[PDB]
Design a protein around this ligand. Structure first.
Ligand code: HEM
Ligand SMILES: O=C(Nc1cc(C(F)(F)F)ccc1-n1ccnc1)C1CCC1
Length: 464
């Protein structure tokens, strides 16, 4: 039907099948498809997700025009992904003016001043992490990274978002833990979302039936859980609070006001954005450290230098360690878990000599651009020196976009980096991580819609 747009514009791309587009080319995942397309179609190419035209762009100037320059005018919203319900008020899903209102009311919550006030909290569960990690080391068994880092992320969110201070690895089946553990990422190549892509006309049907991609058990629990602590346990209390909920509650005190429904929407999305992301990235970081022990030692030397004798990490301490920042950044280059930055074109626009039709999804292949031979040397190699002070200025901010760019970039980039580094400091201060017999030395990525290892990463943990 609409599979004639990219031919009439002279834009190359794979030839679309009726009713399906190039969806069948996702048999090797999102990232492998963009890598191959980049090789055989050049700098700009197009494809169809069902009947949805998608234009991929790789020019840094064009990317900056979409993400930064023309963000408010045209490239304001992302691609709608499915039946959302009340979660349509989340900032990552909001569109047009409501997003601008929500971005304004939530930006002060992510101030670096607020992050510093949350450092003692997430450092508390860094200590909790090594205690439970020492148990897994004294057991002498290969440790699964997703489980220890998952529980650390659980502790961080439940404390920094609501204030429920609870250990998670040794205290499962807790009400908050059991439900928030169900807020798992969306595999957009699974049967449901693949069917949704082929039948986008069924999304209105699912919405009126009150069928939502977010599990209703988790959403209704958290809206009630917020309700019990929003007023029934907060107004009858004069203690100080530092969690995200309190900062959003205080926003309601004095655009417009955050609806109590809107507040629950943002609180859930911060959990959904922060739970498996940190865990996946931290797992990826420990993989590169173990397979390259030279950088693990140098990082352990730098950490022990700034913090002698396992000194408590602090906000100003973390910003000082630059080899830690190099390791984090280089992992995010190899594994940008978003895999893709997408914007929806609200009107006919010509940018950088290219005409973009209305309704086309403009996509930035972050995984492909991070491994392009044009801008990177030995792209498959883990070389943290790329982000050294001497060499970290040759990198274009629009070819390396792990947290996105422009006004719609990750609002929790500082929180994520501070949280992940704080774990890396405490964990490395007390343990050394080495490969196992069960460890996959040539780590293979999944073929689904998530940037995750094929088999779970397992490593050997020894106390220093
Ligand atoms: C842990 C590692 C994380 C990574 C790699 C990451 C990456 C990203 C990326 C690539 C985007 C899209 C930006 C673009 O389209 O230009 C994004 C959006 C967003 N992220 Fe994250 N993110 C992370 C963690 C978090 C956390 C922990 C939070 C919550 C505190 C968060 C909140 C958000 C929000 C709210 C948006 C939407 C921004 C908006 O719509 O204006 N992210 N993130
Ligand atoms: O989960 C992901 N993206 C994402 C999606 C949504 C939404 F579409 F459901 F609304 C909301 C928030 C985020 N998110 C995560 C981190 N920062 C923001 C990717 C990371 C691997 C899968």
């Amino acid at each position: 039907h609409s599979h004639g747009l990219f031919k009439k514009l002279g834009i190359p791309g794979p030839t679309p099948l009726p009713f399906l587009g190039n969806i069948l080319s996702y048999h090797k995942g999102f990232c492998m498809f963009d890598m191959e397309c980049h090789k055989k179609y050049g700098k700009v190419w197009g494809f169809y997700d069902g009947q949805q035209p998608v234009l991929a762009i790789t020019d840094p100037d064009m990317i900056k025009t979409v993400l930064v320059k023309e963000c408010y005018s045209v490239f304001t919203n992302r691609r709608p992904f499915g039946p959302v319900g009340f979660m349509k008020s989340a900032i990552s899903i909001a569109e047009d003016e409501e997003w601008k209102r929500l971005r304004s009311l939530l930006s002060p919550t992510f101030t670096s001043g607020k992050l510093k006030e949350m450092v003692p909290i997430i450092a508390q569960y860094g200590d909790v992490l090594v205690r439970n990690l020492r148990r897994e080391a004294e057991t002498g068994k290969p440790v699964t990274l997703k489980d220890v880092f998952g529980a650390y992320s659980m502790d961080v969110i439940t404390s920094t978002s609501f204030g429920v201070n609870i250990d998670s690895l040794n205290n499962p089946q807790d009400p908050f833990v059991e439900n928030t553990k169900k807020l798992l990422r969306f595999d957009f190549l699974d049967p449901f979302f693949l069917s949704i892509t082929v039948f986008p006309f069924l999304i209105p049907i699912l919405e009126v039936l009150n069928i939502c991609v977010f599990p209703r058990e988790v959403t209704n629990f958290l809206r009630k859980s917020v309700k019990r602590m929003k007023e029934s346990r907060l107004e009858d209390t004069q203690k100080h609070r530092v969690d995200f909920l309190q900062l959003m509650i205080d926003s309601q005190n004095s655009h417009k006001a955050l609806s109590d429904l809107e507040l629950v929407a943002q609180s859930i999305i911060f959990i959904f954005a922060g739970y498996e992301t940190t865990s996946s990235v931290l797992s990826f970081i420990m993989y590169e450290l173990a397979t390259h022990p030279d950088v693990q030692q140098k990082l352990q030397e730098e950490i022990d230098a700034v913090l002698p004798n396992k000194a408590p990490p602090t906000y100003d301490t973390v910003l000082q360690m630059e080899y830690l920042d190099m390791v984090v950044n280089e992992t995010l280059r190899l594994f940008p878990i978003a895999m893709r930055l997408e914007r929806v074109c609200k009107k006919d626009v010509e940018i950088n000599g290219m005409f973009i039709p209305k309704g086309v999804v403009v996509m930035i292949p972050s995984y492909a651009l991070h491994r392009d031979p044009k801008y990177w040397t030995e792209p498959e190699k883990f070389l943290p020196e790329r982000f050294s002070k001497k060499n970290k200025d040759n990198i274009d901010p629009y070819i390396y976009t792990p947290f996105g760019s422009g006004p719609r970039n990750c609002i929790g980039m500082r929180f994520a980096l501070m949280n992940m580094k704080l774990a890396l400091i405490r964990v490395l201060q007390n343990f050394s991580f080495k490969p196992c017999k069960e460890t996959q030395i040539p780590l293979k990525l999944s073929l689904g819609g998530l940037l995750q290892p094929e088999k779970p990463v397992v490593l050997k943990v020894e106390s220093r």
